[PDB]
Structures are given as structure tokens and as C-alpha cells.
Write a protein that binds this ligand. Sequence first.
Ligand code: SAH
Ligand code: SAH
Lengths: 377, 360
Amino acid sequence: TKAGSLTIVGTGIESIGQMTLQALSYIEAAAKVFYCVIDPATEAFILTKNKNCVDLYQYYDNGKSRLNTYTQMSELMVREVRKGLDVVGVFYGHPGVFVNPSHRALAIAKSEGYRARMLPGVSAEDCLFADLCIDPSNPGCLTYEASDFLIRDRPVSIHSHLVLFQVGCVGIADFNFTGFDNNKFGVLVDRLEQEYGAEHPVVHYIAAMMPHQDPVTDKYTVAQLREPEIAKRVGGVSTFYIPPKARKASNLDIIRRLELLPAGQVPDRIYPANQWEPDVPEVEPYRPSDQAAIAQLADHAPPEQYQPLATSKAMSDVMTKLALDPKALADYKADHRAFAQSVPDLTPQERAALELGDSWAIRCAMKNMPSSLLDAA
Amino acid sequence: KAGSLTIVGTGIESIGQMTLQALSYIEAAAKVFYCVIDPATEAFILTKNKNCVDLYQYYDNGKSRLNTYTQMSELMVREVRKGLDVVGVFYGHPGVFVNPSHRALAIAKSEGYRARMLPGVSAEDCLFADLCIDPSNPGCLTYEASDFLIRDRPVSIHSHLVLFQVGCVGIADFNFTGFDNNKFGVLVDRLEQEYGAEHPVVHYIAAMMPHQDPVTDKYTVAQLREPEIAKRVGGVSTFYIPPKARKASNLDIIRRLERIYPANQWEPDVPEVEPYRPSDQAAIAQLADHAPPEQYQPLATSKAMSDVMTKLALDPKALADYKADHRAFAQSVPDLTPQERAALELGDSWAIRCAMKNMP
Ligand SMILES: Nc1ncnc2c1ncn2[C@@H]1O[C@H](CSCC[C@H](N)C(=O)O)[C@@H](O)[C@H]1O
Ligand SMILES: Nc1ncnc2c1ncn2[C@@H]1O[C@H](CSCC[C@H](N)C(=O)O)[C@@H](O)[C@H]1O
């Protein structure tokens, strides 16, 4: 196989703390690090973890197209790959969510035969679910870029969540150092008034970027967005959450064919209610059957089929090492058997299970389950 | 008031996908409650705090999921009511397709206790990274599979579609050996009514151990009816269904507001684009002459200033002290310059930039 690789990782949204353990370990093991982050504390942190770093942010400019900048950023990364080096690229948030240059660079490295991988990170939408206290599963989530939303006339749903990114950059294909003018914002507000109506709520969301700050979670009407004191608050790191207008009725034919309710009855919420919806009929946390479930806790014992963790220090140490040390992981992948034979202090059962590497084998080893094959080691 | 509840995630891939902040809160907690599906991750949590309880033991065969979730949340909230700092830990992102966390946080908040969710890496985040797609182009619709069929939720054939919980269509129960997915054919019918019979559906399973590869298998909608294929769909399975066409642009909107590489590899019958077109080659040529613009501000900080900003993100106690009294905290940090102390005291992002980029 060819020598040289590209791994792209994220930093998360909130400064330093939202970086993953694996992103940190790949930054440290890199021969060379390229980064694009909007926070000085996060930049300073990255520089303490590797001696060979380059700031990609310097390739943005006034009156220079974003597409030119991304071609340049990706070419800087892949040139170092072609010289045989293990390269790491670092971007704000999740490095594949609204990020052009990472997908470009990974696809180039892949087509020329180099190992190429993206590691996921915490996105702005992840932070939004956490701070606004909503689940994308109830009642579904539609996610769009605000200009693409308008240009391609993409459909909304009044019964599901709607999230809109780049609401502070409506129809802007350029970069500007000192911020922008969001003069085309009014085209967006008209569209929202059409689809939802004038008194419908819209939450202006800004996740805290520094660990001491609070999130902006300010609820407005769509009509309030036309007032200028409110419009100027919207900027480059702003997101809109639009709650549902109403609950959608159940399809009676499907509820039958999946056989959940008997005929003759009706399906008329679960606690807690979405706090941001209009006209929300409040739900009680301690209903009668919740209280019976809580009373059963006194005589609760684990069911027979429950299997408690029953591992060793040596096995836990090696599985942790594989997740936190990329070079150890690389060595394991090249030859399972040899790596397994040289781990200190493992039992024969543990060696054989690590040699196989399969999920059922690691579980047998770490939960002390009988395996005919593994107990004979 | 004494007592708090913080709920955190572990991510999807064992250990490595936990955030730095999630780990620091696990370590500082008085009591820890966890629900994870990987023994290496469970073992790692138990080395980081001496007072942990496994919430997975409250599931059972034939026992309602809702009863289990009421129990999980009450166990957490009972410790908060004794004035303790409590941490709950869930797989992935702890508020994405997870009931008990939302319930416990809302109960804690309604009784006057400090309550917060910290985000984590979800199964959808992994999907974007492993399938090499971006939800921005051309939009993403995300549903729970049963809710998708019961409420007859709309498909958008011009956008990404992601369906969670495809391996248990119509099932409210738990079972330790999993369930047979016998109502699966009701999902497939709805997919073929909406997309073609030859339209691709990608069966996605993110790797759970660090050495494993993801499942990214492309099938047709029709070949989901084959029984050898349908058995592979289980409790950690997710479906990605790519767009069937490109949506037309709106001529009116374009007036008022005044393909590109790489292509989505899963869309049927899309010609791949050239990576190095002449506009790209001209972009690359300018790198030989490139100097940083006059408005570019390089990092110019001290060791003392960087150490304190790192400490506020990695040490929950130091953060609490700082929030309580900005001035007193700033005065007690050793080796800061007078400028660095005043900036920490204000604490606004513009102030911190001044100190750490030595701007005039
Ligand atoms: N602090 C914040 N709060 C809310 N939304 C934010 C944000 N920072 C960035 N965003 C959203 O993301 C867009 C920037 S593009 C970069 C997004 C990043 N890759 C991610 O993982 O989210 C903005 O237009 C905005 O809509
Ligand atoms: N390894 C994996 N790969 C793909 N999808 C997964 C997965 N593990 C869980 N899921 C998805 O999530 C559902 C479990 S619900 C819990 C999801 C978790 N909190 C998260 O953040 O993702 C499953 O039915 C499946 O659709």
C-alpha cells in the first residue's frame, strides 16, 4: 500500500471542551496539522498538541470567492499527503456539516490511493437539540441552508421541527473580514409568514462558544423579525429553530396494520412538552402508572438475562489503548495474532478473544460468559 | 440551592468519541448513572468515578419501555433531591432519540435545581462522516421509522432522507435477544410507493469498536424483500436514501437575492465531476505569491493566558468559581499581565481576542 494519509477531525462548537478524545489523539500523532477555527483559546490549545501546524484562516480575504479559498485549503493539505506524511485537518464543529474543503480533500486523497477518513464531531444542530431541549425524533426534523431553502423553494412541514442555518448570510457568495450586510434577510421572513402565518414563533439560537457564556434562546414572532432592533441581532453564527404549528393526526390504516390500538378508541402527549410550540396543553410528570413504576423499585432485582461487566485490569487497559493510541491501533490491525501475543498480563481466554476481535468474543471475555472455544485457551 | 443534574453522551465508537467536557463532568460528579451498549466503554466509565450505577438493568423482556424510562429518571432525580451533583451518561448524543434524559432534566428544572444537557456525537453525525455527505446540500429529512409510517410524514425526493429505528418497526417492547422484524414489509411498501423499485437504499451501521469498519451496503428497494437481506437489519441499523432528482431553481427568488466536486457517490446515475478545472488551477497558481492579508490577525498569546482559558473548559470547579465572581478569580491567577487580568474580568469574546492576538 501507498504511504501517506489524510484524517479530518472536528473541534466542536464550545471552545476546547467539545473536542473528542479521538480527535485530540490524531492531532497529537500527526506529522503535520492544518486548522480552521474561529476561537483563539481553541487555536492556542491546538498549538500545544503539535509542533508542525498551519493556520488555514489566512486564505480568506475581502473580495475573494469562497470557492477559490476552499480549493486552496484542500490543495495545501493534499500536497503534504503526496509527500508521504500522515496529515490531519481540523475544522470547527463537525468537519463535514456545511464544510466544502474537507469533502474535496478527502475525495482527492481517496482517488489517488491514499488512506482517507473523516472523524465526526459535535455540530451546531447537536448543541441546539441540547440547549432548546428537543428531540429530532419527535416529531421529525427538516434541516436546510437558508439561501438554498429559498432558491430551490424546498418544502416545509408544519408538523415537524425546522432548523435553518446561515440565516445571517441570505444570498452571499463572498467573504468579508469585518462581517457582512444581511440586507436580503426580508426575502426569508416573507417565506416564513407564508408557510406558518404571522403570529407563529421562531427561536433565535446562538450556542455558547466560550464555557462561561449562556446560550441565546430568544423566542420571537415571524412579524417581529421585520423590526430593525431584532434583525441586527442576527449574525454569522446564528441559527433559527421553528417549532411545529400543530400535531398531525394518525393514519388509521397503518395503526391497524401495525396493530397498536384496538378499533373504536382514539389516540389523543408524553412528558415533557416541547416548550417552544404555541398553545401547548401541559403534561403531568407523575401520572398513576408512573407512580406504580416508581413503587416497583423497592423489590427490583436484575433480570436473569442481564449480564454484569466482569473484566480484568489488563483487558480494560488494552481496549482503552486501542481507542486512545492510533499507533497501537494501526499495529493491532496489521496482525491481530502477534499484537495479542505481546499484550502484558492477559489470560489465555482474553488473548484468543482479542485475536479474533469480533464483538461476540470481546463480550464473552469482558462479561465472563461461557464459550466452549474460548475457555479451552 | 444545593443539587444539580448534568446529562452527557459517550458518542458511538467505544471511548474515543466521548468529549473532553463529558469526561471532566463524569470525574467531578458525586453520583453517576450510565446506559451504554459496549463493555469497553462501561469499563472506562467505572475507572473514572467510584460511585456508578448501571441503568441497563431496568430493561426487561415484555416490560414496557415507558416504565423503564420512568425508573431511570427517578433514580437520577432522587439523588439530586438530596443536594448532590449528579451526572447521567447515555450512548451517542444523550437527547437524540432518548426519552429518560429529557424527562429527568425537566423534573429537576421545575423544582429549582440547576439542570443542563451537554451535546455528543450521534449516529447521524457518524453517518455524514462515513457516507461522505453534507446535510446542507441538498437538505436533510430525519425521522423515526414508525412515526414516519403512522403519521404519514412527507418524503422530499430532492433531499437526503435518514430513517432511525428501522430494525424494530411498530415495536414498543424490549427483548434481550432482539426482536424479529416481521412488520418490516410495511416500511418497504411505503418506500416503493414514494421512490422507485430500483432506487438505492443504503443500510448503515457505524463501527462500534475502534478496529471495525462501518457497514455501508447499497441495496435496491425491491431487494429488501429478499429474506437473506432483511435479516441483516437490526437494533443499531439506520437507512440512508439519497435524492432521486435535482430540484428546479425559482426564477422570481433569484432576482430578489441578486455541479461541484465531489458528487454524492450514492445517487443513481450521476456523472462524476472534474476536481481540477481551469478556475481551480488558477486558484492553486496564486499560492506561490500568497501573502496573508492586512486584516489577518495571527495568534499572539502568553502561556499563562492559554493555561487559564484551557482550565475553564477542562475543570468544572474553576469554571464555577469564575462565574461566581469574575474580578476575584482574575486577580488570583498567577503570572497574567495587567492587560490579561482586565480582559478575563470583562470576559466578553472581543476582550479575550484583544489579549490573545495583541491587537491595538
Ligand atoms: N454558536 C452557534 N450557534 C448556532 N449556530 C451556529 C453556531 N456556530 C455556527 N452555527 C451555524 O453553522 C453555520 C456555520 S458553517 C460551519 C458549521 C459547522 N461545521 C458545524 O458543525 O455546525 C452558521 O451559518 C450557523 O447557522
Ligand atoms: N452504530 C450505529 N450505526 C447506525 N445507527 C445507529 C447505531 N447505533 C444506534 N443507531 C441508531 O439509533 C437508534 C438507537 S436510539 C439512540 C440513538 C443515540 N442516542 C444517538 O445519538 O444516535 C437505532 O435504532 C439506530 O437507528
